[PDB]
Amino acid sequence: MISSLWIAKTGLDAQQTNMDVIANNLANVSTNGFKRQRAVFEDLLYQTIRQPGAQSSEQTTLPSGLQIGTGVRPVATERLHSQGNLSQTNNSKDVAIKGQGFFQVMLPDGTSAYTRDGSFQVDQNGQLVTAGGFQVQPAITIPANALSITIGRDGVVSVTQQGQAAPVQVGQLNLTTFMNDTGLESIGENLYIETQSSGAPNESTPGLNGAGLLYQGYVETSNVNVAEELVNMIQVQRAYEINSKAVSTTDQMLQKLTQL
């Protein structure tokens, strides 16, 4: 139809995606371990009419030629991997992470997933899982007579046995770090899977190799700044109003072009 209408269409789509990102962040407050999202935009082609160089005469040069340009294509949505607030959930079965690192998980398909959620639970076979029978790595089994389960800041899990006065070392809970935390592809369920942009996973005990510590009895909150999301939402409402005004103006231009 009209170049104005295509450019404005891309603008409406971009603002819509921005509002989608803001709404997803806004809904996911109070979701443990959730990471905020930020949309990065990127203009589309510039259709040149007079080339910015393009010597006109044999001495003059035509500086700053004419090129029109279109579009606001949203190029990316980065995920801010900054530490959240820890809160004292007072549960012996909730463990947060202080610093970089993810709990590796074996999916039913067997491929390696990763979660920054410490709401661990125990199935009917006694092992450690995460809210759905996702068998954590490495394999850990809590003995049936265990009373209190402690997850040391070093990462060793031990149980308090029946009668014997010893917290027997029962397993090791070790983290994984990536070169590109932002690159992990979220698949829902508070799970990230390795992708060819995240980099190879590096497995190591908590507290070492740059990985963070384990805080038993805490939960990590979503690092969603509510006021920042509010200001973003006001801004995107204004931008969408403006772009709709642009579409309206182009449409009225067209209408009295045809009424001609």
């Binding site: 006021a227 509010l230 200001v231 006001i234 801004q235 409402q237 204004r238």
Partner: peptide, 28 residues
């Protein structure tokens, strides 16, 4: 310091409306 917990909560959500003009100027 409770004043800053709300005085700067007001002027962190009002120092943005004036840019974007959803102005009521009357709940201020």
């Amino acid at each position: 310091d409770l004043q800053s917990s709300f005085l700067t909560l007001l002027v962190a959500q009002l120092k943005n409306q004036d840019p974007t003009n959803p102005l009521q100027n009357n709940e201020l």
